[PDB]
Amino acid sequence: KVFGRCELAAAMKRHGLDNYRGYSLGNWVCAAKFESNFNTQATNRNTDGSTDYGILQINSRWWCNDGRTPGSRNLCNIPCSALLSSDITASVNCAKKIVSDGNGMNAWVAWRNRCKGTDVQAWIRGCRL
C-alpha cells in the first residue's frame, strides 16, 4: 500500500497508537516516514544477519520469524511477512509491544536521531482525526 500522509495516521490513531505510552501520534506519523517513508512492503537486510520488516521497520532479529534467522526470538509470535500486510494492525500491534518492553521508542534509529528534537504536531497538522 502506497500510504499517504493523511491515510497512515488516520489509521494509526484507529490502530490504537494515539498518545500510546504518551508518545504522541506525530512520533508515529514521523517514524513511519523515516523508517519506511510510508512503505508497508519495504524490507531491508540488517548487516548482523536479521531483516527489517513492516512499515514500522520491525527487525526480525528477535521480534518475528522470517525463517532465515538463527538466533531469532519471535516475542511478537507472528510470521515476519504479516508486518508487510496492507493492514496496519499487523505492524502497529507489535509496535505497542516494542514500547511494551519499556525501552521507549529508542528501539528505532530514525525517530532516534532524525525525528526527535522537533515540532511534533507538524506531521498531523491539517489532517483530520
Side-chain angles (χ1 to χ4, degrees):
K1 192 147 150 139
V2 191
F3 270 87
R5 169 86 94 57
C6 291
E7 194 173 72
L8 178 73
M12 288 193 124
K13 199 153 183 254
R14 168 202 156 227
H15 289 100
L17 295 188
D18 172 20
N19 302 319
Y20 180 83
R21 301 270 218 197
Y23 292 85
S24 65
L25 187 67
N27 295 327
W28 301 109
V29 193
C30 166
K33 165 73 178 194
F34 294 153
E35 283 286 349
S36 76
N37 186 335
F38 306 160
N39 189 13
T40 184
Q41 277 170 98
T43 42
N44 299 280
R45 169 55 116 277
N46 290 281
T47 79
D48 63 343
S50 68
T51 291
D52 295 342
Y53 288 83
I55 186 161
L56 291 160
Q57 294 281 258
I58 296 145
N59 178 354
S60 56
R61 165 57 95 174
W62 56 275
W63 294 99
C64 61
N65 180 8
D66 61 10
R68 201 174 205 242
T69 310
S72 40
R73 292 264 198 167
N74 281 274
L75 271 172
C76 287
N77 302 132
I78 302 165
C80 278
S81 172
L83 301 171
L84 305 179
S85 83
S86 73
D87 192 359
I88 304 181
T89 272
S91 270
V92 148
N93 191 30
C94 172
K96 293 204 286 165
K97 281 195 152 149
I98 285 174
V99 277
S100 280
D101 268 336
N103 189 196
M105 275 177 91
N106 296 281
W108 287 270
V109 182
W111 174 72
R112 163 75 104 309
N113 298 316
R114 185 152 157 238
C115 181
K116 261 205 201 139
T118 56
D119 178 333
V120 289
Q121 178 58 343
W123 285 270
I124 298 180
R125 67 177 285 186
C127 278
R128 287 190 276 350
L129 300 166

